[PDB]
């Protein structure tokens, strides 16, 4: 890989610079280089990795949705035929998106998850595995769509099982996992009741544990609790 000659610490330093410059493709490439050094990642490093790819794929998903909407409009009654270009360009963006998801899933499988023994690391990586399978599911229309959905579900479920056993209900990783799994249920699995139940139970169990927290932890937890409430408001 192109980052093979760069020191691990230099890659991490440059990832932080790239973040400040809002250069998320660079940030992701630096973090990929850092993962490929083969050492485990610290908490801060895990977050850099996630921030970088979340931003890259987030932009691709937004572009894909714009193009998909145009494509859907082209296939309505009365719409003038404009040739293959809309499908082609949507496919181009889709393929690039799938490539990024496959890259992230590859890092997780080789070998981040298998070396992650602490709950905070293992849950975080399994949540990411769920997330990137969910992004694949968003664009899937073929033979493998059910398997892709199941891969997302399985990863999220393993993460949920560990989080419930090993983390307090206010832990931000536990909360963010539940938030995202709830969205999986609503948007991917056609399970809005499960989505709503999960978000409500997560919120309520967190509420009950806030009393144990410092001011700074309270701020962290309540921010994600508000995201749960926002989704509940959207869905009810």
């Amino acid at each position: 890989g192109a980052m093979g000659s760069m020191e691990r610490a230099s890659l991490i330093q440059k990832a932080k610079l790239a973040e400040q410059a809002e250069r998320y493709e660079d940030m992701a490439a630096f973090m990929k280089g850092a993962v490929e050094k083969g050492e485990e990642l610290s908490c801060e490093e895990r977050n850099l990795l996630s921030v970088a790819y979340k931003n890259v794929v987030g932009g691709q998903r937004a572009a894909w949705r714009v193009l998909s909407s145009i494509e859907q409009k082209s296939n309505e009654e009365g719409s003038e035929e404009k040739g293959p270009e809309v499908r082609e360009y949507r496919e181009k963006v889709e393929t690039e998106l799938q490539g990024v998801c496959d890259t992230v899933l590859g890092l997780l499988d080789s070998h981040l998850i298998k070396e992650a023994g602490d709950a905070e690391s293992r849950v975080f990586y399994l949540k990411m595995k769920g997330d990137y399978y969910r992004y694949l599911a968003e664009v899937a229309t073929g033979d493998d769509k059910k398997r892709i959905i199941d891969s997302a579900r399985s990863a999220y479920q393993e993460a949920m099982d560990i989080s419930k056993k090993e983390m307090p209900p206010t832990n931000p990783i536990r909360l963010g996992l539940a938030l995202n799994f709830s969205v999986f249920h609503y948007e991917i699995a056609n399970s809005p009741e499960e989505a709503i139940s999960l978000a409500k139970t997560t919120f309520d169990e967190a509420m009950a544990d806030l009393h144990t927290l410092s001011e700074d932890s309270y701020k962290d937890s309540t921010l994600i609790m508000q995201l749960l409430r926002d989704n509940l408001t959207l869905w009810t």
Partner: peptide, 5 residues
Amino acid sequence: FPATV
């Protein structure tokens, strides 16, 4: 779209 982190 709904919130995710």
